[PDB]
Amino acid sequence: PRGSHMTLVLGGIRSGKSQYAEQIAAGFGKKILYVATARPKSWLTLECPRHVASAVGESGLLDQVDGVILECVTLLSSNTLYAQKDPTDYEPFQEALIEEIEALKKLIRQSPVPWVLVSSETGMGISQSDAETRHYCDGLGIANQLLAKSADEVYFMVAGLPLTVKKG
Amino acid sequence: VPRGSHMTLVLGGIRSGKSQYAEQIAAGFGKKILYVATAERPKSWLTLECPRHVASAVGESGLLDQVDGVILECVTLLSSNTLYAQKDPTDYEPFQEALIEEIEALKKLIRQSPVPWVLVSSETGMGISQSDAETRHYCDGLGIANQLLAKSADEVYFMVAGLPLTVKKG
Amino acid sequence: LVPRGSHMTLVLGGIRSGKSQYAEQIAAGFGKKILYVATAEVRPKSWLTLECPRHVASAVGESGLLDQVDGVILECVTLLSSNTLYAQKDPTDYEPFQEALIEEIEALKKLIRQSPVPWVLVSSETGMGISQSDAETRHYCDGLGIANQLLAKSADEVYFMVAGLPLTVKKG
């Protein structure tokens, strides 16, 4: 796809989501911006542990590429949690992560090139006891909801194969 | 927003949007909704709190004759309440027996219900298996309850990040 | 024109997802004589039960039983992977376990490719919760996910079970 098109690819551990997202990115074009939040030589890498929208817009690199792949919403959410004063307090973390995600959504709406985003599903096991991990799971689920609802396409990976959750 | 299902099951993980989607379905029932809360929102809705014995409490309230539909929040807490009301939560069989009785009574009440129901439950079985028998038992019993309800339900939706996958539709 | 069934089916799901009941229905669809391969570390009466905790392809082929039945149901990839993990010297070391599990899975795929009768395989989804801290559990989850990817890529049909009901992930 071309334009301000957005695809969300989510799945569990070893679900093949990164491979599938890279296929989608290759479908965008040959010059891909790889945004890492923690490989083809025509791809550019921009490393942004936080404030992804600001850093990508300031880089001006959206005007240089055919598309963007974001790896990954999971680490963006954990980075946001551990940047807070008290990782055991849910509300400030949630506010910060929503801010991050809304800035990303806005940048994508205005983006000249399409984006594919990789994220993790972590909410379908047994709930953990310590507040930090619970908060991280909760906030990641919220981020994934926001992205899926704004995305044009959403794919849920099961054992390397994509289930279409939302399509054009 | 689906319409005209008598019994709908909406299940999903943590922060999957299952409550929002179930409330949309409920609003599709009508303006007067009975909200059955199992813990232990529109102003025209009635709230009935029943941590256990949901079929018994709802039938005894007579409120099914007062509303356009019912939303049950949630099977997850119903199962945990059932587990912890037992003498020995590390003992599987009494818990499973009690939970199955609860679910079968709920199914019968829904079969006889004059108004439709949407039920919210959680998927908890697709992570790493837990070590303590109590958590294993809870996960197991909730999965069994979800199977019984999904088989009875007319429609079943599996939520992924706020969006519904149709698992079963009449 | 006589239709043909699915030669290789993968049924995966979580705890109490109804994956075993659905797979057994598929197996019964194969025919009346079904080989039930149980992998647990050591049902219709027309079925034969073969206990094989490890080296499934070798034991099943050497048994010559593929020529005796209408189909095979493998219960289950989950226990095959855990057996493989705990048969290693150091379960905290990922690479030897991964090699052994991949060898097991590739041998299974090869035998299924040669099989005169269809197969349905039961496995678990374990990768959609919170990542655990201890290396051993992460290793197990990772390796099982790899095994499921390998089988799903080879399978003709793949079903993901939710609360007893099948979602079709791959067909035809």
β-partners of residue C37 are: C50, C74
Task: Give the residue among A67, A73, A70, A98 at the shortest CA–CA distance from A5.
Answer: A67
The answer to whether domain A6-166 has CATH 3.40.50.300 is yes
First to last CA, chain C: 17
- What is the three-class DSSP state of A55? helix
The answer to whether the CB atoms of C17 and B143 lie below 8 A apart is yes
Of C126, C130, C152, the CB nearest to A160: C152
User: Smallest Cα–Cα separation from B72: which of B41, B97, B49, B95?
Assistant: B49
Measured between CB atoms, which of C127, C130, C158 is closest to A15?
A: C127
Name the nearest CA neighbour of C103 among C118, C82, C81, C124: C81
- How many CB atoms are located within 10 Å of the residue C66 CB? 18
Please tell me the distance from the alpha carbon of residue C20 to that of residue C8, in angstroms, as a whole number. 16
Q: Which chains touch C (3 or more CB pairs under 8 A)?
A: A, B
- Chains with 3 or more CB pairs closer than 8 angstroms to B? A, C
Taking Cα atoms as reference points, which of B118, B95, B122 lies closest to residue B106? B118
CATH homologous superfamily, domain B7-168: P-loop containing nucleotide triphosphate hydrolases (3.40.50.300)
Q: Which residues contact A49 (CB under 8 A, 6 or more apart)?
A: A37, A38, A75, A76, A79
HSE of C116 in the Cβ direction (CA atoms, 13 Å)? 9
The answer for residues whose C-beta is within 8 angstroms of residue A104's C-beta and 6 or more apart is A52, A53, A70, A147
Strands B69-73 and B33-37, how do they pair?
A: parallel
Best CA proximity match to A163, nearest among B93, C171, C94? C171
Instruction: Provide the resolution (angstroms).
Output: 2.0
Distance between CA A114 and CA B91 in Å, rounded?
A: 54
Architecture per CATH, domain C11-170, reads as 3-Layer(aba) Sandwich (3.40)
Tell me the torsion sign for CA atoms C115, C121, B157, B13. Answer: negative
CA distance B153 to C131: 33
What are the residues facing C9 on neighbouring strands?
Answer: C120, C157
**Rounded Cα–Cα distance for residues B76 and B59 (Å):** 21
What letter does residue C131 receive in the DSSP assignment?
Answer: P
Nearest residue to A107 (alpha-carbon basis) of A33, A38, A40, A160: A33
Crossing angle between the packed helical segments A131-150 and A90-109, to the nearest 10 degrees? 20
**B1–chain A Cβ distance below 8 A for any pair:** no
What three-state secondary structure class fits C120?
strand
DSSP state of C20: H
Tell me, what amino acid is at B86?
Q
Question: From the CB of residue A137, how many other CB atoms can be counted at a distance below 10 Å?
Answer: 24
- The reply, when asked if residue A129 is annotated as ligand binding, is no
- Chain B: closest CA distance from residue A30 (Å): 30
Contact C136, A136 (CB under 8 A): no
SS3 annotation, C32-88: CCEEEEECCCCCCCCCEEEECCCCHHHHHHHCCHHHCCCEEEEECHHHHHHHHHHCC
The residues, ordered by sequence, that sit 6+ positions from B1 with a Cβ below 8 Å of its Cβ are B24, B25, B27, B28
Residue ranges of the domains in chain B?
7-168
- Provide Rg for chain C, Cα atoms: 16
Give the technique used to solve this structure: X-ray
Mark which residues 140-169 of B lie under 8 Å from C by CB.
140, 142-144, 146-147, 149-151, 156, 158, 165, 167-168
Looking at chain A, the residues that come just before a C–N gap of over 2.5 A are: 38
Which structure tokens are listed for C129? Answer: 């919760």
